[PDB]
Amino acid sequence: AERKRREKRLEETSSRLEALFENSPDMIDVLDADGTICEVNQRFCAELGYDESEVLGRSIWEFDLMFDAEDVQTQLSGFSVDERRKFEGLYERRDGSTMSVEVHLLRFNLEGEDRFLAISRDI
Amino acid sequence: SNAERKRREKRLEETSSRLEALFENSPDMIDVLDADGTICEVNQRFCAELGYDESEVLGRSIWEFDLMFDAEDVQTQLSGFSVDERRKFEGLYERRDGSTMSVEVHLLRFNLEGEDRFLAISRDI
Numbered sequence: 001a002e003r004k005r006r007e008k009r010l011e012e013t014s015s016r017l018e019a020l021f022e023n024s025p026d027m028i029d030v031l032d033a034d035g036t037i038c039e040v041n042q043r044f045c046a047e048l049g050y051d052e053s054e055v056l057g058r059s060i061w062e063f064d065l066m067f068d069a070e071d072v073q074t075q076l077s078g079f080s081v082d083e084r085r086k087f088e089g090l091y092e093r094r095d096g097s098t099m100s101v102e103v104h105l106l107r108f109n110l111e112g113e114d115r116f117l118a119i120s121r122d123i
Numbered sequence: 124s125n126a127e128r129k130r131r132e133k134r135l136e137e138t139s140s141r142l143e144a145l146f147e148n149s150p151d152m153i154d155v156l157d158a159d160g161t162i163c164e165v166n167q168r169f170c171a172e173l174g175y176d177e178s179e180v181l182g183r184s185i186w187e188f189d190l191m192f193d194a195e196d197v198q199t200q201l202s203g204f205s206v207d208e209r210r211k212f213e214g215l216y217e218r219r220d221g222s223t224m225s226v227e228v229h230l231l232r233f234n235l236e237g238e239d240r241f242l243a244i245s246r247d248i
């Protein structure tokens with residue numbers, strides 16, 4: 001009974017947090033220090049017309065026409081832990097159309113790891 | 124196997140913990156409202172940016188914090204949303220210390236674990 005209780009409440013908590021992330025009205029992605037996409041919400045995928053399998057594990061410069069690989073390296077490297085910055089990006093959708101966004105980017109520590117949390121909003 | 128079960132529970136726990144941290148660490152403020160404008164949940168960013176403890180915010184109405192909307196303005200705003208509708212609009216939060224913060228709110232009406240809720244992401248402008 002204690003086991004099943006713990007499991008059931010853990011599911012309920014997780015489910016609510018998952019809905020809050022996936023349904024956020026803004027696009028959300030998480031990067032490692034290499035610019036690799038570690039996580040993305042469904043809002044990010046839907047706005048760009050990609051399946052999450054076409055986004056996770058890929059590099060963020062593949063999606064932002066305003067930044068190449070070096071540009072992204074330079075951007076990420078300058079952040080202090082807990083620093084936030086806002087800047088313009090230009091995402092390329094799966095169909096080749098584009099989306100002008102303002103990205104609000106945070107360097108933070110996630111599960112012991114150096115990560116970046118990006119919230120993108122259509123301009 | 125008990126050992127296999129424990130590994131499954133651990134994976135579920137880590138996932139929940141990860142999603143928790145994404146919510147709390149969001150660089151933008153997050154609040155969840157019911158259809159009456161009552162604040163049901165807030166992330167740490169919301170509390171920190173406005174200078175309030177969570178206990179000073181939960182259960183209050185959003186018009187108590189946004190200087191650009193009275194109770195009637197909030198009621199009218201929320202009642203116009205269809206389920207899954209999103210809108211962006213300007214607000215002006217009043218911090219605990221009386222300073223103000225101009226924001227653009229991106230607001231969503233959606234079904235959250237069976238409940239009629241609004242999810243608001245506020246960006247400092």
Ligand SMILES: O=Cc1c[nH]c2ccccc12
Nearest residue numbers: 064067072075089103118
């Ligand atoms: O993380 C999302 C993102 C979109 N454009 C850039 C550019 C540089 C770093 C991160 C990002």
Ligand SMILES: O=Cc1c[nH]c2ccccc12
Nearest residue numbers: 185189192197200214243
């Ligand atoms: O939910 C946050 C928020 C801030 N200003 C307003 C105004 C009307 C509805 C919701 C909100």
Ligand SMILES: [Mg+2]
Nearest residue numbers: 039040041052
């Ligand atoms: Mg995912």
Ligand SMILES: [Mg+2]
Nearest residue numbers: 192193195196
């Ligand atoms: Mg009015």
